Amino acid sequence: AKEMQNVPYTIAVDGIMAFNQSYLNLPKDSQLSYLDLGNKVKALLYDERGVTPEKIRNAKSAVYTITWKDGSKKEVDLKKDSYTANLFDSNSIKQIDINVKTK
């Protein structure tokens, strides 16, 4: 449950991307909540890019794409924040690409 793992992520706002690359920590061998993950994503956006919930609302599109270890992908729309009970497998996570287009 406890040992952490580095999950790389990228942030692109209107095409602008971070200088190299940073990581995010997630407990291995765990069933995490998409709500919590979505929260981390929003945290990074505000923290690193000063992106507010209000920017995200008016955004052309706000989303973060999950790449599982098998290479497949899942796109999560942040403009549709809304409660969910779905959990995902921590060991299945490969990368997180956050992409926001203001327009």
Side-chain angles (χ1 to χ4, degrees), residues 1-15 17-51 53-103:
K2 211 45 181 176
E3 192 195 344
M4 221 69 112
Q5 205 64 32
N6 289 312
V7 177
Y9 70 76
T10 59
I11 293 182
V13 183
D14 293 310
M17 297 213 78
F19 196 66
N20 233 311
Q21 202 177 69
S22 23
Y23 297 73
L24 136 179
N25 285 178
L26 298 179
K28 66 168 198 175
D29 302 350
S30 316
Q31 283 56 63
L32 313 186
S33 167
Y34 276 95
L35 282 192
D36 290 326
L37 180 55
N39 195 254
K40 237 143 199 166
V41 160
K42 295 184 285 188
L44 289 171
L45 280 171
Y46 183 76
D47 282 54
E48 286 186 50
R49 297 304 166 74
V51 167
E54 166 195 55
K55 184 74 176 170
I56 287 176
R57 286 200 293 287
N58 303 151
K60 168 74 171 178
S61 59
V63 99
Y64 73 74
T65 298
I66 299 181
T67 302
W68 307 101
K69 288 201 204 303
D70 68 351
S72 55
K73 296 160 174 47
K74 174 171 184 158
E75 177 171 291
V76 163
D77 187 351
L78 295 167
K79 293 189 64 181
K80 291 181 171 185
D81 234 297
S82 15
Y83 178 93
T84 187
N86 303 152
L87 319 175
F88 57 83
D89 211 342
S90 334
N91 306 304
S92 293
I93 286 291
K94 177 172 182 165
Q95 190 174 327
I96 296 164
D97 292 323
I98 306 174
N99 189 315
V100 178
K101 301 190 187 184
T102 289
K103 302 185 187 172

PDB file of all heavy atoms in Angstrom, residues 58-70:
ATOM      1  N   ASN A  58     -14.268  28.570 -18.206  1.00  0.00           N
ATOM      2  CA  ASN A  58     -14.347  29.320 -19.449  1.00  0.00           C
ATOM      3  C   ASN A  58     -13.432  28.779 -20.536  1.00  0.00           C
ATOM      4  O   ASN A  58     -13.498  29.224 -21.684  1.00  0.00           O
ATOM      5  CB  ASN A  58     -13.978  30.770 -19.181  1.00  0.00           C
ATOM      6  CG  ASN A  58     -14.840  31.387 -18.131  1.00  0.00           C
ATOM      7  OD1 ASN A  58     -14.409  32.280 -17.420  1.00  0.00           O
ATOM      8  ND2 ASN A  58     -16.073  30.923 -18.029  1.00  0.00           N
ATOM      9  N   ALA A  59     -12.578  27.832 -20.169  1.00  0.00           N
ATOM     10  CA  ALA A  59     -11.630  27.252 -21.103  1.00  0.00           C
ATOM     11  C   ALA A  59     -12.298  26.677 -22.328  1.00  0.00           C
ATOM     12  O   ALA A  59     -13.442  26.268 -22.292  1.00  0.00           O
ATOM     13  CB  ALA A  59     -10.809  26.165 -20.412  1.00  0.00           C
ATOM     14  N   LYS A  60     -11.560  26.657 -23.424  1.00  0.00           N
ATOM     15  CA  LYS A  60     -12.047  26.091 -24.665  1.00  0.00           C
ATOM     16  C   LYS A  60     -12.196  24.612 -24.338  1.00  0.00           C
ATOM     17  O   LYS A  60     -13.201  23.971 -24.686  1.00  0.00           O
ATOM     18  CB  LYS A  60     -11.003  26.286 -25.760  1.00  0.00           C
ATOM     19  CG  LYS A  60     -11.268  25.502 -27.014  1.00  0.00           C
ATOM     20  CD  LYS A  60     -12.399  26.089 -27.828  1.00  0.00           C
ATOM     21  CE  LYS A  60     -12.480  25.388 -29.182  1.00  0.00           C
ATOM     22  NZ  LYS A  60     -13.601  25.887 -30.025  1.00  0.00           N
ATOM     23  N   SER A  61     -11.185  24.084 -23.652  1.00  0.00           N
ATOM     24  CA  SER A  61     -11.175  22.691 -23.231  1.00  0.00           C
ATOM     25  C   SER A  61     -10.136  22.531 -22.131  1.00  0.00           C
ATOM     26  O   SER A  61      -9.084  23.151 -22.165  1.00  0.00           O
ATOM     27  CB  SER A  61     -10.825  21.775 -24.403  1.00  0.00           C
ATOM     28  OG  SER A  61      -9.550  22.111 -24.927  1.00  0.00           O
ATOM     29  N   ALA A  62     -10.455  21.702 -21.153  1.00  0.00           N
ATOM     30  CA  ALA A  62      -9.580  21.439 -20.016  1.00  0.00           C
ATOM     31  C   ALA A  62      -9.633  19.934 -19.843  1.00  0.00           C
ATOM     32  O   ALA A  62     -10.697  19.357 -19.698  1.00  0.00           O
ATOM     33  CB  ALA A  62     -10.112  22.144 -18.771  1.00  0.00           C
ATOM     34  N   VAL A  63      -8.487  19.284 -19.840  1.00  0.00           N
ATOM     35  CA  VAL A  63      -8.512  17.841 -19.756  1.00  0.00           C
ATOM     36  C   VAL A  63      -7.147  17.324 -19.343  1.00  0.00           C
ATOM     37  O   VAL A  63      -6.151  18.042 -19.405  1.00  0.00           O
ATOM     38  CB  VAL A  63      -8.887  17.256 -21.164  1.00  0.00           C
ATOM     39  CG1 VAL A  63      -7.635  16.803 -21.918  1.00  0.00           C
ATOM     40  CG2 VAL A  63      -9.881  16.157 -21.031  1.00  0.00           C
ATOM     41  N   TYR A  64      -7.117  16.077 -18.895  1.00  0.00           N
ATOM     42  CA  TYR A  64      -5.868  15.442 -18.545  1.00  0.00           C
ATOM     43  C   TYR A  64      -6.031  14.035 -19.098  1.00  0.00           C
ATOM     44  O   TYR A  64      -7.081  13.408 -18.945  1.00  0.00           O
ATOM     45  CB  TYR A  64      -5.585  15.482 -17.028  1.00  0.00           C
ATOM     46  CG  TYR A  64      -6.391  14.579 -16.120  1.00  0.00           C
ATOM     47  CD1 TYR A  64      -6.153  13.213 -16.069  1.00  0.00           C
ATOM     48  CD2 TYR A  64      -7.344  15.108 -15.251  1.00  0.00           C
ATOM     49  CE1 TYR A  64      -6.834  12.398 -15.172  1.00  0.00           C
ATOM     50  CE2 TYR A  64      -8.031  14.299 -14.354  1.00  0.00           C
ATOM     51  CZ  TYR A  64      -7.774  12.943 -14.318  1.00  0.00           C
ATOM     52  OH  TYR A  64      -8.465  12.133 -13.435  1.00  0.00           O
ATOM     53  N   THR A  65      -5.001  13.575 -19.799  1.00  0.00           N
ATOM     54  CA  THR A  65      -5.025  12.261 -20.422  1.00  0.00           C
ATOM     55  C   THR A  65      -4.136  11.275 -19.694  1.00  0.00           C
ATOM     56  O   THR A  65      -2.941  11.528 -19.484  1.00  0.00           O
ATOM     57  CB  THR A  65      -4.566  12.348 -21.885  1.00  0.00           C
ATOM     58  OG1 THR A  65      -5.477  13.177 -22.612  1.00  0.00           O
ATOM     59  CG2 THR A  65      -4.521  10.968 -22.519  1.00  0.00           C
ATOM     60  N   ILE A  66      -4.731  10.145 -19.326  1.00  0.00           N
ATOM     61  CA  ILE A  66      -4.041   9.090 -18.606  1.00  0.00           C
ATOM     62  C   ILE A  66      -3.528   8.029 -19.554  1.00  0.00           C
ATOM     63  O   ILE A  66      -4.279   7.517 -20.381  1.00  0.00           O
ATOM     64  CB  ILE A  66      -4.989   8.336 -17.639  1.00  0.00           C
ATOM     65  CG1 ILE A  66      -5.567   9.284 -16.589  1.00  0.00           C
ATOM     66  CG2 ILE A  66      -4.232   7.186 -16.962  1.00  0.00           C
ATOM     67  CD1 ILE A  66      -6.500   8.596 -15.596  1.00  0.00           C
ATOM     68  N   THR A  67      -2.258   7.676 -19.431  1.00  0.00           N
ATOM     69  CA  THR A  67      -1.724   6.605 -20.243  1.00  0.00           C
ATOM     70  C   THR A  67      -1.399   5.459 -19.286  1.00  0.00           C
ATOM     71  O   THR A  67      -0.602   5.613 -18.362  1.00  0.00           O
ATOM     72  CB  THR A  67      -0.455   7.023 -21.004  1.00  0.00           C
ATOM     73  OG1 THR A  67      -0.749   8.150 -21.837  1.00  0.00           O
ATOM     74  CG2 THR A  67       0.035   5.876 -21.895  1.00  0.00           C
ATOM     75  N   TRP A  68      -2.059   4.325 -19.492  1.00  0.00           N
ATOM     76  CA  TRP A  68      -1.833   3.152 -18.676  1.00  0.00           C
ATOM     77  C   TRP A  68      -0.544   2.493 -19.107  1.00  0.00           C
ATOM     78  O   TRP A  68       0.020   2.835 -20.139  1.00  0.00           O
ATOM     79  CB  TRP A  68      -2.980   2.169 -18.843  1.00  0.00           C
ATOM     80  CG  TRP A  68      -4.268   2.813 -18.612  1.00  0.00           C
ATOM     81  CD1 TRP A  68      -5.152   3.243 -19.558  1.00  0.00           C
ATOM     82  CD2 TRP A  68      -4.796   3.217 -17.348  1.00  0.00           C
ATOM     83  NE1 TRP A  68      -6.201   3.899 -18.959  1.00  0.00           N
ATOM     84  CE2 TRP A  68      -6.006   3.904 -17.599  1.00  0.00           C
ATOM     85  CE3 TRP A  68      -4.362   3.082 -16.019  1.00  0.00           C
ATOM     86  CZ2 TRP A  68      -6.792   4.445 -16.578  1.00  0.00           C
ATOM     87  CZ3 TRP A  68      -5.139   3.618 -15.000  1.00  0.00           C
ATOM     88  CH2 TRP A  68      -6.341   4.297 -15.288  1.00  0.00           C
ATOM     89  N   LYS A  69      -0.077   1.530 -18.327  1.00  0.00           N
ATOM     90  CA  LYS A  69       1.158   0.866 -18.674  1.00  0.00           C
ATOM     91  C   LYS A  69       1.065   0.110 -19.978  1.00  0.00           C
ATOM     92  O   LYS A  69       2.045   0.039 -20.698  1.00  0.00           O
ATOM     93  CB  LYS A  69       1.617  -0.051 -17.546  1.00  0.00           C
ATOM     94  CG  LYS A  69       2.152   0.732 -16.336  1.00  0.00           C
ATOM     95  CD  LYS A  69       3.068  -0.134 -15.459  1.00  0.00           C
ATOM     96  CE  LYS A  69       3.144   0.374 -14.017  1.00  0.00           C
ATOM     97  NZ  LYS A  69       3.589   1.790 -13.895  1.00  0.00           N
ATOM     98  N   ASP A  70      -0.106  -0.426 -20.309  1.00  0.00           N
ATOM     99  CA  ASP A  70      -0.238  -1.168 -21.560  1.00  0.00           C
ATOM    100  C   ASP A  70      -0.267  -0.251 -22.785  1.00  0.00           C
ATOM    101  O   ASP A  70      -0.421  -0.708 -23.911  1.00  0.00           O
ATOM    102  CB  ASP A  70      -1.492  -2.048 -21.545  1.00  0.00           C
ATOM    103  CG  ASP A  70      -2.775  -1.244 -21.574  1.00  0.00           C
ATOM    104  OD1 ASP A  70      -2.701  -0.009 -21.436  1.00  0.00           O
ATOM    105  OD2 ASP A  70      -3.858  -1.848 -21.732  1.00  0.00           O
TER     106      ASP A  70
END
